[model samples]
Target chain A: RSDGRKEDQLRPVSIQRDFLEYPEGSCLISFGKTKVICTASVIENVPNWLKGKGQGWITAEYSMLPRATQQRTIRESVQGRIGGRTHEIQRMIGRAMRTAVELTKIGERTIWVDCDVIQADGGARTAAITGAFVAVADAIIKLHKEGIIEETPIKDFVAAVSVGIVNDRILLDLNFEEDSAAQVDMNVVGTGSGRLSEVHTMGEEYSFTKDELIKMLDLAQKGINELIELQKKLYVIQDGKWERSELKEVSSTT
Target chain B: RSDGRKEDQLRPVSIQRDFLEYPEGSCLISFGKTKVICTASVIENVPNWLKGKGQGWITAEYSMLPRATQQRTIRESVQGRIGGRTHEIQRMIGRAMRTAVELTKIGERTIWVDCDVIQADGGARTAAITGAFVAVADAIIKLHKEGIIEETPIKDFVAAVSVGIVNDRILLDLNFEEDSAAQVDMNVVGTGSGRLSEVHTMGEEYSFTKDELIKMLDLAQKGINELIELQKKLYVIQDGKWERSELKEVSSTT
Candidate 1:
């Protein structure tokens, strides 16, 4: 009730597709005060290690602007080294998206998912994963419509959400204040088909029982379901609205 | 003679101190086809581990723009992670700068040295270390003149240069073509006093003999000496010229 929301309710979420023109796919997603820009750039070459695998690769990078937080945060570029938390979250996003897509369906290439946080309150990583999936879908469709690939590589829509326990009460989509004070925090990533992709749970100040874990997972599942619905709407709108004819015409010309 | 220069010759080098006004110290340094912008920012607090140690810390971050090379290189921000080579070079720069300064002289503060490459032909990392030392000196002078510290933390002028054996010939400050084709490569960082600070040597295409290593070291030492002279001139000029009287008078006011 601190922010006038029920324990099981998520923060207001908004998603904008094709947020930028240069990237093959892009989205700007907002979870309350937290906002992240996710872009998927398709590169023709794969990493040297996977060069002959005949499979595409998906990877992610996560960064926050220097002034994203209340107190200005330093850029990793300025620091010359990335923090462990940033590295971990980006890796998680990459892994989550990989499970949602069929890499073999695409050609031997790489799709880079870049998530830059413009404003951070809490749950930035979760928002990044949810938004990047939409971007990935847009990219796969672009490749397919351009005749680069015969079939769409995406297997299903993926989304993520944060859940926590604070003062013996389970809360979904905890904001900055709630997250800081929460006893147990967990981030859950799942596909649209109700299959789990990754679960990152940490007990900060207090430990929880098996029942508490079950309750948190249930709450997170609900939030992820809502997020997946939004992601599907954004992807379809982005695909059908613009550039469809141009892509097909361009493919035929080439 | 690939670039119409002698084997023991360095490419034309230039260093512009105080190139930017935002950071406490800044420099724009160029070595032939390579260009790097180095900045030093002074933070009042040290890292958590260094808080009670009564000493300051110096660290560096290194990056190159997408168009810095002939073939566009992707940004680490987009990669969501820094490559191993970038991480290793930045760490080397930080270590080289630390050896040239007396960190204990400053309070519990952290000096962040950021080297961003605007153009990359070769020897970018060596140029970064050479330029960053001047920026660090400028920052230390500002802090000292403002009465924040008892004395300047800079111990001596430091600079770096690249030397390599390409096609059985030793060359000083190798450009991209020469560097890529080199048999052995080495970077040497040293002080104005002719003392070595750091040496990073690698056998790329061929195993190096002791005689060849000595020859390369000699060539690099000559180039580093020239760089150190330039660094000293820039620092003294930045300190004594223009605002010299104003800084002393302002110190009294404080």
Candidate 2:
């Protein structure tokens, strides 16, 4: 608030597409201070149970580096089992990507999205889901261009954002310091149309009022709209074809 | 083969007991070139699920440093679940220690032994099991002396040794080079009386005859006997109660 930005104003976003060379699609996307490297890999076959179902599955794995936090935290992978927080975040990423793609049209192959958090001040999981959408989209484009598929099957753009109730006022992109002490924390994933794919809201010891939830959803919708623009800009730079763009922007003097 | 030492001769055994200050019993034991740091932690009660079970459980976890091998191997613990080899080794260590202890006397408590290999030329698992016995024994002695347990939980001495068939010759304590080319490898855990706790045998592509198995078992048994003697010597030193023997005959009387 001291930066003179409005309560709904988002921190600066920086998205770098195709950050790694091997994966079909990969990007290191940062929203405000949160950064995650999301990579989408295409496997040749679907799961045994899904082989004849004609539906593809999307799964996500989330990781944070030891130095990602101010104080070094043990990697959940090292701890032998994923913690609840990491499991919940990865579940959100999977839901967000599953909604963005048209699985039946994509055929039998499965796409796996891996979101590795390189650094986190806040909103890392949200940024991961947003970046993973672009990655999956780019991967589908490659599959189509390479004739692995008949055509692209990406149905829509998807992204997420973190909003929280701090000191009774809703704030967008609450950083680690504020998040640690926040009374209520929520991560909201939405489509470009502002329809929610996942909404995880929690108050430490009490429930939030209906008005607070509404304010969070409203702030979340605005953040997702901004995220969709970022995703569209990445596809434009990479020459990736998409199925739909609701918030399309064309600035030209023709 | 090039070391010129006899096949039955052990690698130079060296131990620095009480390596870490915090753990109840901790030791850095090195056999020839392989090195492992074994720590025994005494938990008041057994695992939650094992609650009310008359006998205690001695659980072990085996791990290697990323740099333990000549070329860095990704940590299995960091890879979500323990690898088959690590699981197999840990299971063997627990069995080895469990058989060596009189669990009925220990009440509802359990001793957890963690064997972390800091460096590995070969014999990492065997060295871990061998040294872990010493660490666990020392911890149990502490329980008895402190009157926490009325009687010693340790029933007998136990140790492990590896014997492998290299170039059709039975070799005791195979190093990395010989181990990689081993046609048949077996790890044997035995108590001082030569009763077996575990016998893990594996062949490279083909099965070994009973005769070869017998020969490897014989070599492993002899090596394990030497390890048990080493454990006894150390226990005597730690207990500050050494009876005069050929190994301690020349030492100053306390």
Candidate 3:
């Protein structure tokens, strides 16, 4: 009821796939009040550090406009370094999408994911990860359909969301206002199989006991369950992302 | 040769004055390989929009780091908004410093300036407003000494330089390829005494006649010549800046 949006309510979500003229797959996704542009570019080679691993790699970068907040912000890239908060979010986006990828099946090629948040009310990073998953899925599906790969490469689905406690109330999604005043803030990332990728939480006013963490986890699990359904609804079968998912065990079997 | 420098020669320069630091009224200047950092703060009030503004603002946003080219680079910001080209040269560095001052002189506020040149190829924003001109000058001397405003508003004198093309010859201060390419390039902006405030050149590879353009260059030369010596000179005692030179009004007054 913070912004008159429901507890389990997602922001009004919309997607524009292949929105950009370039990039292997690109999408502009809007979650209620948050907006993120996600792109997946397939590279012919892996990172230098990953050479000869017989596995592919995926990485991500994230950015926000200086005016993303109410006030104008100084530019981080101008400073010649990425901030820790940005680094943490970028890593999360990469991992969230990577969980859905069957890197080994994609051969040695790599996919670079760039998720730029244009507007953020709340759940920007979560929306970036979620939206990027769709972009990546489309890319893998396109590669398979074009015969660039024998099967689809995405192994599973991944998404993320934010939940918190503000004014002694447990909230499902925390926008900037509530987030600013939140007593406890938490972000939950989970895969389609209901396994947690990352859970980050901090209490500003009071510490939480183990039971409280479990309650938060349960709350997050419910959120992820709903997200899974949304992912399947948006998932396109002709895209061929799951063929690689089913064939992942062949190398071990052989 | 342009300004008595060789074809590949850099500018001849020096650094001086109360540049150490004192919360307010401090600055650094650089020429060619030279660099400077300027600091200023507000007292008594904030900007017009910030009246009764309790919220103070401090921003040090610009870069020419230790190595701007071929070697070193400065630290970038955490927000990832500013670009490398922009981070190095800003039209508003001095303005940003001035914003720290409360013109009415009643509210407390402050700002700092650190202008560095990583690569000394040539013409680094008129060498950071001609080595951080009296940005700290009046603040540290006249106003502060008289107690008219508060503390010294400026710590020292500063100036800048620009050289461009006339016929086919390479001009002075033609570091940026832009100045080199402009057919009728001109840089003009000087201090209270009619010294260089800013010098810009517009080379028209195409249209525009030479006579009108040369007239512009002559205007720039007149401004820059006065500024070059004004940079190192002592503050005027009686009518200081008023004695320097008058701005070119749209129409003259007899």
Candidate 4:
């Protein structure tokens, strides 16, 4: 009850879809105090390496605004160099989104998922991946409806969650406080069909045993399954547009 | 005669210092068709790796606006990743700036040089380095005026230029047309004291002999000397702030 929550409980996630009209798909997603704006834009051209190839491409970029943190963080634009942590997280998001996309279906094109964190507390990367999934799905749905693509390129729903061992307890969704004090931290990306795309676990302070890893994986699976349920219920394509979810507003202020 | 300029000539170059009021120092530099806005911001904090060290840090980041090119190139913000060329150029600029700075004199702060290309023909990286030197000098001068530093951190004036072999002719500054058709290209960074800091040579489509490399180096030195003269005339710090040059506006329009 450090943050007044059970070990398996997740922060309240409120996803505001179609947050922007310019992009094919956009969402303002909030995970408790963390907020990220994820937008998906479709390009008619592919990358140089993918040129002349029949398949398309999917990629992502992640950035935190200057005032996102308690202390004012400097802009990467102003820094003239992107930090390694930023590159790693954005790379993870791109890889996770690609696993949910069947790129071969969209001819000679590319889909860009941009996640800009307006406010960051914890689990920003996981929130980015989860929100970007909805943005990409909406973009692909638009392409299918406009006869630009024959079928939806999204293979399955993809979401991510952070699981950690704090005080010898396996926490399902660790916030900033738990994450900073955790001995072991792991980020898990999983598909809706119970398939794992990536399991990135780092021993922050202390290494975990095999049994602890298994327990962490089990907790991550539960968290991801719950996220996927919310995703499918809210972002399903009906006819040519998204069908609204009837679920009441879920907030976990604790 | 493509743009009515001689093979050994440079296009029009105009340096407008103090272009922005926000940053400690700013310059809007244009080399004929290429234009870049370079700003220097002094951060009170140093990078984690450099923390506790008495010496300061100097870094740079390079970017091109979406409409800088003839065809719209997606922003790194939009693409979600910086390209290899941008990273290479910006890294080179930062290294060149460091050669002109005395890091130990600036305490534990960091001087960030941001070069954003507003328009591009060619030679943008070289121009950025040349302009950023003036910006950094202004920033250090301000620090000294504010009683924050005992002496200026700038050791000497630095400048850079591009020399290339196109259609069997040695060109001083290559615009987009000459650059695209060039067989060999080299960028040279030099100090006002006639010392070479960095000489980046590449045989784009054809290799060159030692004699040609020597010839290109000679041309680059000639061009850089002329640029250094302009820098001395324009951005001379007098007692506290920068002193205005009595010389009439110099434009290198061929």
Candidate 5:
């Protein structure tokens, strides 16, 4: 009700590609007020276990700036160890990227993904996954342009969004406030082909019936489609070549 | 013998104070080929458990640069966890700092120490401990200078050095090659008054004898005193006030 967003609607989100020059591909993405920079870089080789497997790999590292939140959070670098929550999100980001990319066609190279949150309100992990999909796509495109690969290695565009039931009502793409007030929260990650890659659900103290779950997933799918469409608008490939368009003209929230 | 030093002698060592501007105290220290930057910062509050205890606390974190060794070491920040050896060294550094500082006199604040190895050959942890001692001293002096505490919080200057038994000989300070060939290795941390704060000993698989252990400690203590003398040369508090002198004119190795 607040911020003029409907229960079934999403917060303002956008993906600004090529945010940094060094990485093979990079993007600064926003999910409402939360902002994260997602980048993909190619490593020459895979890990030891992947040797002779003849397949490439993709991994992600997630971190937030010390002042990302309202209160400053100590850096994992300074703490000498990463926190459990960061480890979990990084794992999830990798899973989503792996699902969207065709690893077998990419050779033995490893694609390293980095998602750093510059500002945090809520849904930072979800935002990272959605943005990393675009970043990985650009990286694969670069591999083809550099003659490292001759074919496109993308399966489809991937996107993720948060859904929760608060006050007995289902809400899609929750902001920090909505997530804090929700009794049952869930996140759904899906691809452009309309298939789900991951679904994480939680009930803090109140459980919902299967009927409520179906409703949540239904709303989550709708939101995922809207995000992937935005990706399609930015750049899509046809016949192994990039097809470009303008995303700035498109209103992100509408 | 290759470096023209006897079995009972140490490599070159020196402490360069005020290496960084922002921290309360900082120094770059070297143990022969190994180099580390140690910094101390004052946090306004203590950890939750130490609340209202009327005693301050000291903690330490240890890290190394990617190119510190011959080969690049992946960052723990990117690895999602700290290595077990790093955890061990950090705990040891904190123990040495706690033994050197009179924590009860500093009140409820916390002194955070950071030791980052810029170049590592061997004895990096020992260098960290030795340099952190100097860094903490400067931090405690600043606390007294700012009228935060009435009495000096430092008990005395502390230093650490390595000892090993290699090829049936007790070596006072082992470099990387010497340590790699060591049958039994030990590190001793002690104060200016000749009181030991910590002793870490390890034998990868071979056991050490009692007579060999005594010889190693004797050599380690000798090396520790030599390093602490260098610290005392830089500055020594006489009756609760700092007495400063020059250290560069003092040849580090000779």
Candidate 6:
């Protein structure tokens, strides 16, 4: 453990909600030293291809600042082109956010998730997904309050956990050094209602036994469970209530 | 007179060379209230298509900051997509750059020009081309001095000027208000050697006579000539010479 933590121990995690003034929902989330600003903006219309689809869409864009890493990185806007890795991470975030919400319930709008890394150590992509889910939930809450949505479209909270094998030992929630050193890694996304959304694994010539898989899954689930617990604390609560499932002014269909 | 200037008069223009440290060539240029930072970086290799072509390439990327305008504009990075308008302007700048450089003489490298608008009033596209041209020239000089290129590959200086038919009058460089008020606009790209590279027209004129285009071209040519004269001033002088055309470490073909 570079920072003196146990093999399976996750990095110190924190989420600061409403981090930016203008976004409908924004949070600055940090996983140890990696910091990402997750924002959810509610755009009234979907793209032309999705016109009259009735269901809303969730899409995301991901970026890292020039000085996010140890050395300066070139700006993609300066390059006038986006790399596939960026597109992949943005899709991953959008997918995870969609897993937490029921799109049809939001009508003809779109939730644009923007995740920008101001500082990157490691686990920035997973952190973006974890933070963006909370921002999405916050935006859903706003939609309900404005009677834009009759009920909360939230299905359940979602969070991501990253795990990898460093040398011969399996490690959970790695930092930059560990992430770079390990060739085999997996990302697990889980819903708060005791459901698994997606699990993505990477590396070449990487094969694992069923027992090893179980151990990795258990470690990721543990970390995700703790993240969800922290997320639950960010919401409003009264007495023994975990908030209602409904709020609205019913409207005509498209 | 609009903005208290005659129809043939250009807005105030200023060019600050080497505005940003680190880049081989860079400048902060302003035309009226519009300001753009132009930077040129040397990448050793060209794209896959240009590989083994035995020639260099000059390309550009352009963007405006979120707060570059009166109302905060959405960052294109956040949109997860590039717009045609942005791509159009970048292509325009690149074409103008290509006209100024003899690519084969620079070898297999690529000159990456980055233009970012710090503030925008009007004529940003034209200003980017005009400013980016200077950055390209500066980069060429550095390449020659470093012996990366044996000789200067610059063919001639290039600049862009915008003119439009507003109401019944032909105005030379316009401000935001005047630009927004007109539908018929033309952009002229001209070389310092008195050759025209491009003349692009936009929007449907209800109608215009041949004399109007000649008038616009003459005005644009006048403005471009002045810009080139300013560019020539930024170079160093030694004993009544405009600097030699060569510097070298001769190498194998590309």
Q: Against the correct fold, how does model 6 do in TM-score?
A: 0.53
Q: What DockQ number belongs to candidate 3?
A: 0.10
The lowest-lDDT stretch of 10 consecutive residues in candidate 2 chain A is A245-254
Q: Residues A132-160, candidate 3, lDDT per residue (tens digit)?
A: 88778878877887888888867777878
Query: What DockQ values do the models have?
Result: 0.06, 0.03, 0.10, 0.05, 0.09, 0.08
**Residue A245, candidate 6: how far off, in angstroms?**
16
Which candidate has the top score in lDDT?
A: 5
- Indicate the residue-level lDDT of B201 in model 3: 54
Candidate 4 lDDT by residue in tens digits, B1-254: 48888777777888887765446666877788787777787888898999997999988877664334343455544345545777788789899988888898988998888786656788888889988987888788778878888888677789899999988899998887888899999999999889999998899869999999999999999888888877887656644344445542445534
User: Which of the two, 4 or 5, has more lDDT?
Assistant: 5
Please name the candidate that would achieve the greatest TM-score relative to the true structure: 5
TM-score to native of every candidate shown: 0.52, 0.50, 0.52, 0.52, 0.55, 0.53
Q: For residues B1-254, what per-residue lDDT tens digits would candidate 5 score against the true structure?
A: 66998898888776888665446677878877787778788887898999998899998877664434433445566555555777788889998899877789999998888786756788889999989888888888778878898876688888899999888888887888889898899999888888898888889588988888888888888888888878887775678566445552233666
Question: i-RMS, every candidate?
Answer: 7.9, 11.5, 13.8, 8.8, 8.4, 6.9
Q: How well is each residue in A42-105 modelled by candidate 6, as lDDT tens digits?
A: 8888878888978999888777644344434556554566567887888788888887778888
Supply the global lDDT for candidate 6. Answer: 0.76
* TM-score of chain B alone in model 1: 0.91
Q: Where does the lowest 10-residue lDDT sum fall in candidate 5 chain B?
A: B65-74
With a 3 Å backbone cut-off (N, CA, C), the pairs that clash in candidate 5 are none
Report the Cα lDDT for residue A14, model 6.
82
Worst 10 residues of 1 chain B by lDDT: B245-254
What is model 4's interface RMSD? 8.8
Question: Native-vs-model 2 lDDT?
Answer: 0.73
Rank by lDDT, descending? 5, 4, 1, 6, 2, 3
All candidates in order of DockQ, best leading: 3, 5, 6, 1, 4, 2
Task: Assess each prediction's global lDDT (C-alpha) against the native.
Answer: 0.77, 0.73, 0.57, 0.79, 0.80, 0.76
Q: Is candidate 1 or candidate 5 better by lDDT?
A: 5
User: In terms of TM-score, which candidate is stronger, 1 or 5?
Assistant: 5
